[PDB]
Amino acid sequence: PLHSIISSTESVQGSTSKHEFQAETKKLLDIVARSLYSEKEVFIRELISNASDALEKLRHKLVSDGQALPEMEIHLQTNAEKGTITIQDTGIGMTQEELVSNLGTIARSGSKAFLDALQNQAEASSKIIGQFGVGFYSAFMVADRVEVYSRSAAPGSLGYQWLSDGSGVFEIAEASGVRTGTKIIIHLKSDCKEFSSEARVRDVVTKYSNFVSFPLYLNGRRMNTLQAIWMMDPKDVGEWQHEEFYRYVAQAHDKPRYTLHYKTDAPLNIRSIFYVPDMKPSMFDVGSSVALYSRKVLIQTKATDILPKWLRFIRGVVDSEDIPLNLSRELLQESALIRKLRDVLQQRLIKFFIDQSKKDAEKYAKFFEDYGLFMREGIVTATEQEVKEDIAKLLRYESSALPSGQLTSLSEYASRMRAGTRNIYYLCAPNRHLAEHSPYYEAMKKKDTEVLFCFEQFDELTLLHLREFDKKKLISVETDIVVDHCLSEKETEELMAWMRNVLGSRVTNVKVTLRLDTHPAMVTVLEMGAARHFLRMQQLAKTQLLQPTLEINPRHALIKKLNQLRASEPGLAQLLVDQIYENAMIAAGLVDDPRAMVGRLNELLVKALERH
Amino acid sequence: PLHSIISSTESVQGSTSKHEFQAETKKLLDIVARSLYSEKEVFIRELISNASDALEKLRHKLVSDGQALPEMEIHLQTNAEKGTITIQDTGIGMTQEELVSNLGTIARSGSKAFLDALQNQAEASSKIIGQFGVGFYSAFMVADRVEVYSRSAAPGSLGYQWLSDGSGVFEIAEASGVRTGTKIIIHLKSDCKEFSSEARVRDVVTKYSNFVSFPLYLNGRRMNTLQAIWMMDPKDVGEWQHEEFYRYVAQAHDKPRYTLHYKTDAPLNIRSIFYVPDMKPSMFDVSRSSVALYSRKVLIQTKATDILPKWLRFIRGVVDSEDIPLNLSRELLQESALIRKLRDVLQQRLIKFFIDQSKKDAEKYAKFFEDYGLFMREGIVTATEQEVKEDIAKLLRYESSALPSGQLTSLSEYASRMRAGTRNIYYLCAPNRHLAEHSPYYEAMKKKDTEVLFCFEQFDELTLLHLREFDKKKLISVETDIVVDHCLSEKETEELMAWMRNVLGSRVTNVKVTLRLDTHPAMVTVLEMGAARHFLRMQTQEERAQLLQPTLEINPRHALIKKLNQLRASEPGLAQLLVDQIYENAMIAAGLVDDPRAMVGRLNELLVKALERH
Ligand SMILES: Nc1ncnc2c1ncn2[C@@H]1O[C@H](COP(=O)(O)OP(=O)(O)NP(=O)(O)O)[C@@H](O)[C@H]1O
Ligand SMILES: Nc1ncnc2c1ncn2[C@@H]1O[C@H](COP(=O)(O)OP(=O)(O)NP(=O)(O)O)[C@@H](O)[C@H]1O
Ligand SMILES: [K+]
Numbered sequence A: 001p002l003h004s005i006i007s008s009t010e011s012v013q014g015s016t017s018k019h020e021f022q023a024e025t026k027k028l029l030d031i032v033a034r035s036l037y038s039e040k041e042v043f044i045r046e047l048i049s050n051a052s053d054a055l056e057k058l059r060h061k062l063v064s065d066g067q068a069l070p071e072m073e074i075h076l077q078t079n080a081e082k083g084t085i086t087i088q089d090t091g092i093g094m095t096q097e098e099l100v101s102n103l104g105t106i107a108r109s110g111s112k113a114f115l116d117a118l119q120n121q122a123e124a125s126s127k128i129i130g131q132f133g134v135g136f137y138s139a140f141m142v143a144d145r146v147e148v149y150s151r152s153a154a155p156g157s158l159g160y161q162w163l164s165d166g167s168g169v170f171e172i173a174e175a176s177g178v179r180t181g182t183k184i185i186i187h188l189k190s191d192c193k194e195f196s197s198e199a200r201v202r203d204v205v206t207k208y209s210n211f212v213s214f215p216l217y218l219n220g221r222r223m224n225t226l227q228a229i230w231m232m233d234p235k236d237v238g239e240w241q242h243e244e245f246y247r248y249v250a251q252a253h254d255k256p257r258y259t260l261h262y263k264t265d266a267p268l269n270i271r272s273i274f275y276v277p278d279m280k281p282s283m284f285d286v287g288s289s290v291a292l293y294s295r296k297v298l299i300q301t302k303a304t305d306i307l308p309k310w311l312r313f314i315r316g317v318v319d320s321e322d323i324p325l326n327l328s329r330e331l332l333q334e335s336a337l338i339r340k341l342r343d344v345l346q347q348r349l350i351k352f353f354i355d356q357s358k359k360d361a362e363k364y365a366k367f368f369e370d371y372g373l374f375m376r377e378g379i380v381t382a383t384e385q386e387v388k389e390d391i392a393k394l395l396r397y398e399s400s401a402l403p404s405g406q407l408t409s410l411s412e413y414a415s416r417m418r419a420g421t422r423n424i425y426y427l428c429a430p431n432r433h434l435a436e437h438s439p440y441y442e443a444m445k446k447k448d449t450e451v452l453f454c455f456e457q458f459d460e461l462t463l464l465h466l467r468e469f470d471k472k473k474l475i476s477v478e479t480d481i482v483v484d485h486c487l488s489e490k491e492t493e494e495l496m497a498w499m500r501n502v503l504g505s506r507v508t509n510v511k512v513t514l515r516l517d518t519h520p521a522m523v524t525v526l527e528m529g530a531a532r533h534f535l536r537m538q539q540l541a542k543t544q545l546l547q548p549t550l551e552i553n554p555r556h557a558l559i560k561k562l563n564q565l566r567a568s569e570p571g572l573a574q575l576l577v578d579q580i581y582e583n584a585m586i587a588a589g590l591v592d593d594p595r596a597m598v599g600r601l602n603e604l605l606v607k608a609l610e611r612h
Numbered sequence B: 001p002l003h004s005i006i007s008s009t010e011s012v013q014g015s016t017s018k019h020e021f022q023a024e025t026k027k028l029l030d031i032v033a034r035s036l037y038s039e040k041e042v043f044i045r046e047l048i049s050n051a052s053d054a055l056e057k058l059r060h061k062l063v064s065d066g067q068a069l070p071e072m073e074i075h076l077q078t079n080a081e082k083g084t085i086t087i088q089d090t091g092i093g094m095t096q097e098e099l100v101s102n103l104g105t106i107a108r109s110g111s112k113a114f115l116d117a118l119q120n121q122a123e124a125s126s127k128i129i130g131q132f133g134v135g136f137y138s139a140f141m142v143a144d145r146v147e148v149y150s151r152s153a154a155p156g157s158l159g160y161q162w163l164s165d166g167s168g169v170f171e172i173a174e175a176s177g178v179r180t181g182t183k184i185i186i187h188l189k190s191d192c193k194e195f196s197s198e199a200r201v202r203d204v205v206t207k208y209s210n211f212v213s214f215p216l217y218l219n220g221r222r223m224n225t226l227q228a229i230w231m232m233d234p235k236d237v238g239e240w241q242h243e244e245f246y247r248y249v250a251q252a253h254d255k256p257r258y259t260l261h262y263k264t265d266a267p268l269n270i271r272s273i274f275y276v277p278d279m280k281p282s283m284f285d286v287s288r289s290s291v292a293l294y295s296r297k298v299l300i301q302t303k304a305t306d307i308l309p310k311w312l313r314f315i316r317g318v319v320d321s322e323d324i325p326l327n328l329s330r331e332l333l334q335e336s337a338l339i340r341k342l343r344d345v346l347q348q349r350l351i352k353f354f355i356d357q358s359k360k361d362a363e364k365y366a367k368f369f370e371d372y373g374l375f376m377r378e379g380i381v382t383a384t385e386q387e388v389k390e391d392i393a394k395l396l397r398y399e400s401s402a403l404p405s406g407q408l409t410s411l412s413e414y415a416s417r418m419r420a421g422t423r424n425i426y427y428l429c430a431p432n433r434h435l436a437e438h439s440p441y442y443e444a445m446k447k448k449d450t451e452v453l454f455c456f457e458q459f460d461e462l463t464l465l466h467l468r469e470f471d472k473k474k475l476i477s478v479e480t481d482i483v484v485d486h487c488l489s490e491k492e493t494e495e496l497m498a499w500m501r502n503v504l505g506s507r508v509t510n511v512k513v514t515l516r517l518d519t520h521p522a523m524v525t526v527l528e529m530g531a532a533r534h535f536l537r538m539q540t541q542e543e544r545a546q547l548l549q550p551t552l553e554i555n556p557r558h559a560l561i562k563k564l565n566q567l568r569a570s571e572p573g574l575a576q577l578l579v580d581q582i583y584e585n586a587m588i589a590a591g592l593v594d595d596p597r598a599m600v601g602r603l604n605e606l607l608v609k610a611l612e613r614h
């Protein structure tokens, strides 16, 4: 049954009254003080941002008036005796009306009003941080009573006072002896007395607001001691600062091997810089020091992964003034602009690596040898076909049709290949000597088609997952053999019948091949790539057999000896085939742990040499 | 640069005034509707929670006076052409005064006053969700006009109207014929018309508000059809209830091989359930903690806290509590102190439970250990505290030489029968039982009357070196202890020994003799065998052997070694091949070969000439 009661019988007949939305202050203050910020160390960051905004406002006003610029700086005082923290700046300052309209009203900020009266919003709107208006009340989260002493920068403004305990009541009075600017006095709570020490304050200042645009003083000394090189032009920063900055963000002692200075403004504002370490990636390498900034203050998201996961081996910093933020000044989760930011960064980073090989191929070879693991991971974990192909341009392989010791790409491979050819062949082997001596490649010697050699691990899996490059099918050499379209015939036929009976449980069928010269036998299976992966995966973990085919080579010297061995030592003949069968399995790559074949090997040896 | 402008010259001189804090409603509404919630689909959950709170208030009012209990229902309606969504409720209802006090004021909730004026906080304080007072204002985030009809259930209340354009100004009127309860009419935004589709709303409801304590309906039919079993006592839930509950949570139609119903209050109020799938794990299980946190019967959607450790990701269930502090965005305060202690308590509770399951049923635990054995091994290598290592080591089932084939034993029961004054435990690695028994290393320690453990699973040699201790006992591998511990004619032996230094000097640095072997012609002993095995696979014979120090020991009583003497001078060419085969065989037996594909060629040409005389 459809238990529905919705109707449209509601009737409106009276005269509608008009009211205005109200607001309750005590609950809002409690919410801000208790259940808004996860950490308790953000109030100093908010105060520093406010001081920077005030200093910027004063500088802009003086520039507009064209007067003499005085000294402007921010001072932090840490007094551990009374258990108090004090911050003082030299900004514009606020009069009684401004104090009442700003410090006494929730969700009200004068910075937005000032920006609305700029008529350009480009000269100073890129440096104002405050946008909500509830950042000051984070002081009550660690304080019980607050004192504010402010005097405006106007020639004739008097000092004032601002007393409040954070309980919905505040008072204002006129003061004397107050200098130009503002001075915030904070009385620390009982459980929050850790913030009255210099070490913790210095740590938080260095973590959050290290790159403030104005001098910052704590008990006399200055903490910034560094420039934000991601906001400066590339023509104004030297090569020496590019290394010192890298050693700071990466927390290392080496030099970077690459340096990208990206700066774009058309799709969205990006001011970023990236580095690649000289040293080889370690085990721990398998936010990745890509900390996100906004108006030169740390955001500390570390979870949204603004950079792709496979690109976790690079360091640097990213700045953007258009990213949306929570009320707690934290990054929004999976915003529309955030997804677009990740795509833009990935496209530029891949393009940068392509030009590096085009400029200096020798340097790129060393980079690919060390960091090549990360590129293979990206293709496997990708979900869009165009993403896989774009990343695949960075792969390097060496082919049989070229001298040993040089690497080729999948792009130029499609250029020198014949127009009649349409698919790409690849053979996997531990080395190149084994690859050319591999029995699978020996059958391909008849055709002149060019093949690529894959040596490193996961190359076979990476090629299988890609499955297509530039509309060209990727097919392995092993799969193309089963699909491909001395020992007279009479004496040959009975020899297989003696193997089918013995190896019936292992060798499902045996057929005579004519394309082998060196290896006595081969093992062929349809899904060779999957078999070489599934078998290695099962021994890798007990998670959620097959039918192999063996082909003998009549022209082989050992196979010729099998005719005269059965009629003389039938016992020795059985062990010999059990050794040839496992030898073929090892060459194919379907070999299990080889500890079990030692017993059959030593026993065969001690009986096969008792003739000398 | 010690120059500080900080001083204390400033002081108060004039009279002090007095002022009251104010607020800006428009900016507050903009913040709530634009920069508060990450995802735009939370308004349905908020309004459903409000309806549930109203129904709870009505239920308390109707049970307090001891009167009959009418029907409580939630009705969701959708209209594609109109682009409107309707959620009608039959709760207490609100008159003009409650409407203007609660709806018309930001951060004002009547539930908190109702909760505090309860005087008992026993039956209703645990089922009230709203505590902030800004939940209703999330409707403006998706709607261009909000229209609400409501009337109280009091004997004499009348219907009313409520309109708001989202511009900070609302309006109230009087209405007749309004059904008792609350009815919310929402007109959707132009770009937010995707919420007028039945499938998307069904997804939102089945994601956020599955376990509401009242029957809810969507377009006529019921969407709940399932009760929350973790709230009741374990005696009130049956096996068939568990199967359906495990089916929904884990999306698996099989039977849960394990079931735990944790209920603790001394550290903090916890009401959680757990499950273990019967099927075998796959990559989707291994690939990334599959447990959804709950609080007062509503989804919280943590997705980042990971309340359970990484190695315990193979279990499924839900976790509920009422003492978790969540911020204004209805999400947990990240890295909170109270959150950290929940992870450790839950981990150790499950550690004890798995120990218990072994006692009452060893066969069931043994089958369970084989299926998920990677997860316990994974936790040991990823743990930092030594105390936790012992808690996990009790869950490992190994096999020793004191029992026949196919009887697994634990470390604790292994260490209860070992020697008196020596703190040593012996473990050996082999793919099978036959290989372990015939391993040359085991044959070397057969002299002593000591017990040795045979572990057959992979990555187990790495676990025993990371654990490093078990109740103050040193873990020593069989291969390592051989080095630590301190026929053929002599003349023919030493000259035979001297040849290998001449022909294997590049690959062998020292050759010795062992008399304790009688079934293997070769043996390789290394100082740190366990470390070499795991470090070799992650990272041709010359540079490999340089970092392994492959000491070679040859049994002189083996028949193969004896025949090498009479083949020394008859054909030196074949002798160069057989000695290499012995060297290669020893490495294969020792398991220190990265890939045996290179040794096939040398072996293949040996057989073609070994029996050519036949
Ligand atoms: N040190 C200061 N000097 C001058 N004005 C200040 C100072 N600190 C705060 N204000 C004023 O306080 C008002 C709002 O304070 P605040 O709480 O910081 O909001 P906001 O910083 O503008 N926005 P946000 O910090 O992002 O929440 C504005 O009018 C500021 O000009
Ligand atoms: N449908 C409703 N029926 C009855 N009372 C309601 C209804 N919706 C809202 N109210 C009342 O109006 C108040 C304001 O709504 P709301 O913003 O959800 O507050 P809250 O839910 O208690 N706290 P929060 O968790 O932020 O939603 C509620 O606390 C209720 O007292
Ligand atoms: K303010």
Ligand SMILES: [K+]
Pocket: B102, B103, B104, B105, B106, B107, B108, B109, B133, B134, B135, B136
């Ligand atoms: K409200």
Ligand SMILES: [Mg+2]
Pocket: A046, A049, A050, A129, A130, A131, A135
């Ligand atoms: Mg600010």
Ligand SMILES: [Mg+2]
Pocket: B046, B047, B049, B050, B130, B135, B136
């Ligand atoms: Mg609510």
